[PDB]
Paper text:
Both proteins contain a MBD (methyl-CpG-binding domain), also known as TAM (TTF-IIP5, ARBP, MeCP1) domain, AT-hook DNA-binding domains, DDT (DNA binding homeobox and different transcription factors), and a PHD (plant homeodomain) zinc finger adjacent to a BRD at their C terminus. Our crystal structures combined with biophysical and mutagenesis data demonstrate that PHD zinc fingers recognize N-terminal unmodified H3K4 tail, whereas the TIP5 and BAZ2B BRDs recognize H4K16ac and H3K14ac, respectively, with specificity pattern KacXXR.
A peptide soak of unmodified H3 histone to apo crystals allowed us to determine the peptide-binding at high resolution (1.91 Å). The structure of the complex revealed that the N terminus of H3 is recognized by main chain hydrogen-bond interactions with backbone carbonyl groups of P1714, E1715, and G1716 located in loop 2 and by hydrophobic interaction of the side chain of H3A1, which was well accommodated in a hydrophobic pocket formed by L1692 and P1714. Peptide binding was associated with structural changes in loop 2, which was shifted about 2 Å in the peptide bound state. As observed in other PHD finger complexes, the H3 peptide binds to the surface in an antiparallel β sheet conformation with the TIP5 β1 stabilized by backbone hydrogen bonds with residues L1693, L1691, and D1688. An important feature of the structure is the recognition of the H3K4 side chain, in which the N terminus and loop1 of the TIP5 PHD finger harbor the lysine side chain, forming a shallow but well-defined groove. The limited space in the lysine binding cavity and the absence of the typical aromatic cage present in methyl-lysine interacting PHD domains restricts binding of this PHD finger to unmodified lysine side chains. A comparison of available structures of PHD fingers in complex with H3K4me0 highlights how the lysine side chain recognition is essentially formed by acidic residues and interactions through carbonyl backbone groups.
Author numbering:
A (entry chain A): 1673 to 1728
B (entry chain F): 1 to 5
Amino acid sequence: SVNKVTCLVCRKGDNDEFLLLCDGCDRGCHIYCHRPKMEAVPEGDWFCTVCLAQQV
Amino acid sequence: ARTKQ
Ligand SMILES: [Zn+2]
Ligand SMILES: [Zn+2]
C-alpha cells in the first residue's frame, strides 16, 4: 500500500510529508487540499469522509 | 495521525 496512497482531492501521490493518511482505511489527503484549512498534520487520529460515513 | 512519508 502506503507508497501507493493518493490524495482524495487532487488524486496525486506527491509531497508525501503533507499527505495525511486515514486511520480507518487506505485513503489520504494533502493537508493543503483539505477544506476547511488544516495547517499541520494532526497529533490525534484522523478519519476520511468514507470512514466517517460508517460511524454511528 | 501520520503521513505517507
Ligand atoms: Zn491533494
Ligand atoms: Zn478512511
